Nucleic acid binder design. Structure first.
Ligand SMILES: [Zn+2]
Ligand SMILES: [Zn+2]
Ligand SMILES: [Zn+2]
Length: 85
DNA sequence: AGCGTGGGACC
DNA sequence: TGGTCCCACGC
């Protein structure tokens, strides 16, 4: 919690100094990761990785119940719960 | 659905 | 630093 965002208009606080560094990019608008397929810029390398799958169609996450594939684990997570009742 | 994207964590 | 998951939330 000791790490406050220096931007004046912003008052968000962070427990980890590094979580502030990432956060600073929201204010600086820095997007240092580019998709070589569509040239779009992204603020995070991990977000670029999952974005690229929208081009290749790579879906490494399969639902345990029906086997349906998803590009992201969170999409699979959101899906799996539909099998309930 | 499709998928951007920030915060927390872990390495 | 900086890479990479999970999470969550949003549209
Ligand atoms: Zn801030
Ligand atoms: Zn792209
Ligand atoms: Zn399923």
């Amino acid at each position: 919690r000791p790490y406050a965002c220096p931007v004046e208009s912003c008052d968000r606080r962070f427990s980890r100094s590094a979580d502030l560094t990432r956060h600073i990019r929201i204010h600086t608008g820095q997007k240092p990761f580019q998709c070589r397929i569509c040239m779009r810029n992204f603020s995070r390398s991990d977000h670029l990785t999952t974005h690229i799958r929208t081009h290749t169609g790579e879906k490494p996450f399969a639902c345990d119940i029906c086997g349906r594939k998803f590009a992201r684990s969170d999409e699979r997570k959101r899906h799996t719960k539909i099998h309930l009742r």
